[PDB]
Amino acid sequence: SEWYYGNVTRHQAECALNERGVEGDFLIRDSESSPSDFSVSLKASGKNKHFKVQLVDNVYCIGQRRFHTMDELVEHYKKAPIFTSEHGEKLYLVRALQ
Amino acid sequence: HIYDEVAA
In CATH terms, is domain A1-98 a member of 3.40.50.720? Predict the structure, then answer.
């Protein structure tokens, strides 16, 4: 669970990603927007990205995809893009922020 | 806070 940073805020995540991260580095943190949920924060060129993960009945929901555990979700997005740009750029989770 | 759209 090297990627789980706990209750770090969105701002703290932005700073940490920019100070210590390279593109593809990411963290999972508690959501500041809803109590039992999470955010995936990803270092990306120009502007970092934040994705919602909603925990419902022990299932981790992101977009229209569902995962048994946060680990499964994270591993999925190392192998399938978590974001795709208009110019064909596919962004993947690569590594927990160090 | 605004969140980014996850890729399908």
Answer: no
